[PDB]
A paper describes a structure:
Two host-guest collagen peptides (GPP)4-(GXY)4-(GPP)3, where (GXY)4 sequences are from the α1 and α2 chains of human type I collagen, were recombinantly linked to chains A, B and C (corresponding to α1, α2 and α3 in collagen nomenclature and omitted here to avoid confusion) of the NC2 domain in the following combinations designated as α1Aα1Bα1C (for short 111), α1Aα1Bα2C (112), α1Aα2Bα1C (121), α2Aα1Bα1C (211) and α2Aα2Bα2C (222). Three unique chains form a parallel α-helical right-handed bundle.
All five constructs were screened for crystallization, but only three of them yielded crystals of sufficient quality, crystal structures for 111, 211 and 121 were independently solved using the MAD phasing from selenomethionine derivatives (thereafter designated as 111sm, 211sm and 121sm) to 2.25 Å, 2.10 Å and 1.6 Å, respectively. Whereas the crystal packing for 111sm and 211sm are similar (two trimers per asymmetric unit), it differs from that for 121nat or 121sm (one trimer per asymmetric unit). Overall superimposition of all trimers showed some drastic deviations. Crystal structures of 111, 121 and 211 constructs demonstrated that a staggering order can be manipulated at least for short native collagenous sequences, meaning that such sequences are rather adaptive to various abnormal conformations.
Author numbering:
A (entry chain B): 2 to 61
B (entry chain C): 1 to 67
C (entry chain A): 2 to 67
Write the structure that this text describes.
Amino acid sequence: SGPPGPPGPPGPPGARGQAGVMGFPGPPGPPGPPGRDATDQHIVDVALKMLQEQLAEVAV
Amino acid sequence: GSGPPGPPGPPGPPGARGQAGVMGFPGPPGPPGPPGKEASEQRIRELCGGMISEQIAQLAAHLRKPL
Amino acid sequence: SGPPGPPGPPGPPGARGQAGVMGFPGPPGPPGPPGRAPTDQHIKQVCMRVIQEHFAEMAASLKRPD
């Protein structure tokens, strides 16, 4: 004859949420170092060659 | 008299999605730049031909001068 | 003798997902700038230095004792 029962116990907790989204791609690396500057040696070698050539041409 | 408590409720909602991942590592440094091009012999000869010739001529005249 | 109760309330939300995986590594950097080539003026300056540095050899080739 009596009153209906209580609402039941709260349900079980839900499953774990899906893992987070992948992070942003890393930035491009820094630019490489500057190439070696051309040294003066290749100019010195030729200048010395010309000096010898022209000095010898005065000898003749 | 008074009723049994109802059956257990429905399962809860799935948890919130995880936080976004951390940014990836920066790339490696680029390759070194190409070496500076050397001047050709012809280019050097053209630029220094008259200079060397004038210097030799001036010196030759100076050393074979009479007082 | 009383009716059974209504079904309980919806349960807890689940625990939050684990953090996402780190992103892709970045691409390699660009190649460096080229080395510098000599200018016409620089070439002339070097040539004049060589003449000065070997002026002794030049004089000797043109004039010696006796």
